[PDB]
Design a protein around this ligand. Structure first.
Ligand SMILES: *[C@@H]1O[C@H](CO)[C@@H](O)[C@H](O)[C@H]1NC(C)=O
Ligand SMILES: *[C@@H]1O[C@H](CO)[C@@H](O)[C@H](O)[C@H]1NC(C)=O
Ligand SMILES: *[C@@H]1O[C@H](CO)[C@@H](O)[C@H](O)[C@H]1NC(C)=O
Lengths: 48, 21, 87
């Protein structure tokens, strides 16, 4: 029983990960923030 | 699930496969 | 001159880069494009009505690998993120 519960438990992780892209919000935020940082940094070159 | 003005990007010392080991 | 680092001056739009043939479709009244950084991205040759991309010349950081002068004076140089054909 404990075996089956753990195996099935593993499986649900796939679906939650496979379906919900927002399950990985934290890492995506890190990239996005940095991407925002650089883009702002780039854009200032246009300022007078 | 995750995605010329002097600005570069250095590569990480460990590689993605390196991490996997 | 194409495909080579040149100092270019088109109608007073000066700069340094590699001039390549482009696939951009300028409108008949647009002399030159831009990037998000307000740097020139493409120009129209005033004598030959064609569109040229401008790519900044290859560059990269320089990092020295030294075993330690206490051991050797022989060094190895790392040209970051540059193809070996341009060194
Ligand atoms: C300007 O004259 C040159 C020859 O000196 C010619 O090749 C070029 O086509 C001319 N530009 C035009 C017709 O727009
Ligand atoms: C390294 O430096 C020490 C002095 O701090 C010196 O005694 C030693 O000989 C040096 N190593 C070599 C290989 O020369
Ligand atoms: C480096 O140059 C060679 C030609 O010698 C080319 O085949 C290769 O794709 C180039 N690599 C990059 C990353 O531009």
């Amino acid at each position: 029983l404990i075996a089956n519960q753990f195996n099935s438990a593993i499986g649900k992780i796939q679906d939650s990960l496979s379906s919900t892209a927002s399950a990985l919000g934290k890492l995506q935020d890190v990239v996005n923030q940095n991407a925002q940082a650089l883009n702002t940094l780039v854009k200032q070159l246009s300022s007078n | 699930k995750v995605t010329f003005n002097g600005l570069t990007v250095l590569p990480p010392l460990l590689t993605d496969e390196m991490i996997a080991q | 001159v194409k495909n080579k680092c040149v100092n270019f001056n088109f109608n007073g739009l000066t700069g340094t880069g590699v001039l390549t043939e482009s696939n951009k479709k300028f409108l008949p009244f647009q002399q030159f494009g831009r990037d998000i950084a307000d740097t020139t991205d493409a120009v129209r040759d005033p004598q030959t009505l064609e569109i040229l991309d401008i790519t900044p010349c290859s560059f990269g950081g320089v990092s020295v690998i030294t075993p330690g002068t206490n051991t050797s004076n022989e060094v190895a140089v790392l040209y970051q993120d540059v193809n070996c054909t341009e060194v």
